[PDB]
Design a protein around this nucleic acid. Structure first.
Lengths: 129, 143, 150
RNA sequence: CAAAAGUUGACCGAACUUGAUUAUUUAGAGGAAGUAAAAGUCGUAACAAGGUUUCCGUAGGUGAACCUGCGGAAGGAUCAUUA
RNA sequence: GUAUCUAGGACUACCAUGGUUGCAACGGGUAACGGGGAAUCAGGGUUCGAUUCCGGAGAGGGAGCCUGAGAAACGGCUACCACAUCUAAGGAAGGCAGCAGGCGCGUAAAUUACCCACUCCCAGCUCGGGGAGGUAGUGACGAAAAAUAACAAUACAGGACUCAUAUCCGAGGCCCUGUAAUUGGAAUGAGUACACUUUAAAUCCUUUAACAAGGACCAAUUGGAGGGCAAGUCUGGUGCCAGCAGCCGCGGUAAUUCCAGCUCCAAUAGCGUAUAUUAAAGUUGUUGCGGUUAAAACGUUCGUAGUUGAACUUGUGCUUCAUACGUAUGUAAGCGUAUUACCGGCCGGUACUAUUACUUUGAACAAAUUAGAGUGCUUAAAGCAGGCUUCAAAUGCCUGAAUAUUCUGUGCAUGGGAUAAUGAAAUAAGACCUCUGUUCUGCUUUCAUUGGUUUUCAGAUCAAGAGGUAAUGAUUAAUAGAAGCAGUUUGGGGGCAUUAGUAUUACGACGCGAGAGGUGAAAUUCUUGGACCGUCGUAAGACUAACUUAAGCGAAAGCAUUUGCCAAAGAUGUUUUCAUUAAUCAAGAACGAAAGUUAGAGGUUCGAAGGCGAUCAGAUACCGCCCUAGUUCUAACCAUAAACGAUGCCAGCUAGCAAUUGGGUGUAGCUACUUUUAUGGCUCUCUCAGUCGCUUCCGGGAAACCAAAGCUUUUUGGGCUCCGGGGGAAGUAUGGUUGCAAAGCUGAAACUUAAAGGAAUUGACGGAAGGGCACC
């Protein structure tokens, strides 16, 4: 069915921005997705997200600036022992300056930049550039 | 597309990897130890053999040449090899029943170019080398 | 899904947003509760109670009027059938079509589908053993199944 | 009281013999393949509808190719027209 | 219990029936000791390790034993088996996988040298012994540093600058770079060689007299020059010969590939080549491949392991303070059933508290290695030296031989509470707490001592009742699935009974006659007159033309006459139920066209084989005739096909139009009718889910194409399987398995070979198709 729900929504976002389309209907929106999406907001990559209360599993409408080339999702969530943070950022990020790798860390779903400041590594959720 | 990309799928990759590496041609040769079993060198870099016969090997088309190979029996295995005599004139240097060094043609087996079934080179006759003898820098030890 | 067939076709219950309503409904939770007991004593399954009561009454949703779903209500008053109704119906169909196959052997489509009907019982029952609503190592076998329906 | 050669019963047990077993190697009348083939002999099989469209599974027969029969597919020669 | 230094099935009696396994056990193989490590890299990895250390093991293969703290010892013993030795013939004595040496094996690896001086060990020892180690000799595995010449000038050469003259063109001439075997003195010892230094004593280095430079001396190479690949379309010889070429290719008489020469290039104290490995190789894909056609979806599905898995569940904030720039809040403190409670003066303990995987920080990480700090080992490999006031006087001053990571993972300790699971308690012996002195377990102080009695204390726990406390214990129902279903409805889905139609074939009757079948034309074959044919009926078996499709169903194979029954599936619809049940799958199973096969029925038709007529060299075939097994059906096999839509399945998303299958919402639309309706079908409108098309991609692709073959990333994207990793050999061999058998599955290699495949393009060519044009 939808084993990882995360990727299904973020693919929808990519496909949408490939039309240029500012809006997407996301299904079936997780907590991990909400935390993924709040992380986007901070760096301005997407405009406002809104989670509708169906008594089912929650859908989201995305408003999109179009600043985003592409958003990818890591499953399996590979265990980062802090010094693979450096390797993972190099491979899939277009620049050393910019583009956030997204983790599920002990203290929250946080970007690798934020994770480095806290010194808390993790399991890898995602990539956003 | 395919791969078991789940968090604890962890055995399955190794199992499947070994199932896929089964087909890997270089790993088949290594694991099954084919060098020692089938290949006339036992993965041994050189072999000294005794010259049986000189062979006038007719070339594959579009080349009509008599390309001058030598039948060699290795000392370790008694295995019959046909090896080419590279650089000039050379069968005149080979002489039947001489001790000859058999080396390969750098081709992971596979028969030369247009030369039928000659997987091998000759590098030496009577411990001097062919190579020295053509240039003339050295002269053949008696018998 | 549709695990038996290729069929994508989903048709499911659209639940009205208002979790407490309906406002017009004069009838108490006791009143609806009482009818659930009476119809259940008449041998109506919780599905059959849930549909009949909506039309005859107004019972919009049994859950909304009285906080407990039909099966929960029946259980508290002890009307609960020994095996949950969804299994009872599946088990009824498997026995019925097995009895058909003894009569009309060589129905190659029927036997194939006979496997599907047992296969789903075992899987669905497997879940209920986890709930402990079915005693652990409860097994579907055909001999006992025939008796079970009746 | 000590005490040698010898020696009793035990347990470890090398070693040997014979059956069984396994791995690994290698002889061989002859049969039956494939390959290098490169000047040959016999056919034209397929490649154009290859003059019998092709080609699959399977059986039998033809010197062989292949043909044929039964069910197929199009990788056809119909992407079709045709109340 | 015994043994032993010790736990111990180590061993033995008795007594139980256990232990291990798709998380790959048991077995077999391994150029398989392990690790520290090495190689190769963008990283990730892949490969290596026999060897310089650490641990263990063994000492021809094996077994047994004494001594001694310690050996199941071999440069101890005893034995056997295998090897080897001497002998006065009775016997005895041995372990180079120790150092040298020899033989043999092989591709492959050194001296029958010297020494305890260094390093250190052992011994009774200041002292002896030491092939432990050091020393020399051998040593292009490998690494490290470069002697082999340099400058004016002369002979002519170039390029500026000048005088010029300014295509041309000459003269002066410079920092130079040179092509010259012309010159000229200089430089510095590699080598050589007193001496000194070195050393245990020698050696070489580091020192240094005496010596050594016109290369013919102090005298450099190894492959290549068509392309890859850097450099001859050179000259002689050869002429598809010899031979060359890792590959493509050269060589058939300008050979730019050969063999030389000459010229030159590339790397030069090294270079060639072989083998193994790694990069390239994305050709192994964890990172990070491909699967419509290129090598690639298992026939299809169920389905267990495996694997995976939706949403919801201490958490947001508000205020203020501090702190970057009126803000910002990120940092700090407050406030709302787990920061509550003491003691000692917020601090620090104590009392503390869901399991994990993960992750965080700590310790714990052998040195060498690896990275690298400090440092002129004269450079350097790296050594771990040495530098300083000071070469005075002098132990005076002294920095040192760090730090990290590889020794992974793990384990230990600690933090977090995200992610993914788990947790009470809805059949409430549910959670606290509290009342029964109710219950059971259960006691050292003090009754001077010590003992007996019984109270308090209940030392300290438990369990059972009753009451009060509680938000008092049931989460949504993934535009997920299961299931039922008000039901509506679909379909050539399946099984069984049944039914219809004509024909094909045969037969009779009737009826009229000498031809008929068949083709390219023919003949066989049919007829002696009644075939063939007509007509009529009937027998037999088979099958549903047209209607019938880019149309349906079924998991797929497959499924087209009628009608009845039985049960199934799917779409739609459902404010029903369940409340993650699910998704996909090794194994295993279900179904599985046809041929082939077993036994009957059945055999009309077609019709493998056979035998026939033409054709044709052949026909054995196409073609024509007769027709067997077979087609059909039934009870069994088989498990395979282009089982094909060459395209796995499940979910979401990404484009217009019109068809098309089915359901539903509106039809104040047409028609059917009852006085009109109500009903039904179709269009019209709207919408799901189906199968496709068209044209465009708004992506992919090599293109053809593909709305999937898109989202396949910029070496990534949901989940999961299966398959391919050059072409052939080969779907063969071999063994196992299944099968009655035929076969089928699983499925190599030897060896062969530089292409192979797919695509599109243009030509050529057709006994493939349409137009034209000319009295060859």
């Amino acid at each position: 069915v939808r084993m990882n729900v995360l990727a299904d929504a973020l693919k929808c976002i990519n496909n949408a921005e490939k039309r240029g389309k500012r809006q997407v209907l996301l299904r079936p929106c997780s907590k991990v997705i909400i935390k993924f999406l709040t992380v986007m907001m901070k760096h301005g990559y997407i405009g406002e997200f809104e989670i509708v209360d169906d008594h089912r599993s929650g859908k989201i409408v995305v408003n999109l600036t179009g600043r985003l080339n592409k958003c990818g999702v890591i499953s399996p969530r590979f265990d980062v022992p802090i010094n693979d943070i450096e390797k993972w950022t190099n491979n899939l990020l277009p620049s050393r300056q910019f583009g956030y790798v997204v983790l599920t860390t002990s203290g929250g779903i946080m970007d690798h930049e934020e994770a480095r400041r806290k010194h808390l590594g993790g399991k890898i959720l995602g990539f956003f550039f | 597309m395919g791969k078991p990309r789940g968090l604890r799928t962890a055995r399955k990759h190794v199992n499947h990897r070994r199932d896929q590496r089964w087909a890997d041609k270089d790993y088949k040769k290594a694991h099954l130890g084919t060098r020692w079993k089938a290949n006339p060198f036992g993965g041994a870099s050189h072999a000294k053999g005794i010259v049986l016969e000189k062979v006038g090997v007719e070339a594959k088309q579009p080349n009509s040449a008599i390309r001058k190979c030598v039948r060699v029996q290795l000392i370790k295995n008694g295995k019959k090899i046909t090896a080419f005599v590279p650089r000039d004139g050379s069968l005149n240097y080979i002489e039947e029943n001489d001790e000859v060094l058999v080396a390969g043609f750098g081709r992971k087996g596979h028969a030369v170019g247009d030369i039928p079934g000659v997987r091998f080179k000759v590098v030496k006759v009577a411990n001097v080398s062919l190579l020295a003898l053509y240039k003339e820098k050295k002269e053949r030890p008696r018998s | 899904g549709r695990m038996h067939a290729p069929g994508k076709g989903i048709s499911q219950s659209a639940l009205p947003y208002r979790r407490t309503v309906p406002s017009w409904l004069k009838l108490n939770a006791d009143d609806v509760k009482e009818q659930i007991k009476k119809l259940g004593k008449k041998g109506l399954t919780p599905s059959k109670i849930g549909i009949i009561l909506r039309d005859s009454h107004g019972v919009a949703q049994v859950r909304f009027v009285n906080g407990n779903k039909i099966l929960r209500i029946m259980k508290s008053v002890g009307l609960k059938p020994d095996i949950p109704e969804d299994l009872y119906h599946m088990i009824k169909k498997a026995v019925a079509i097995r009895k058909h196959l003894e009569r009309n052997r060589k129905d190659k489509d029927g036997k194939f589908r006979l496997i599907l009907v047992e296969s789903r019982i075992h899987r669905l029952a497997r879940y209920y053993k986890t709930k402990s609503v079915l005693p652990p190592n409860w097994k579907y076998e055909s001999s006992t199944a025939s008796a079970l329906v009746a």
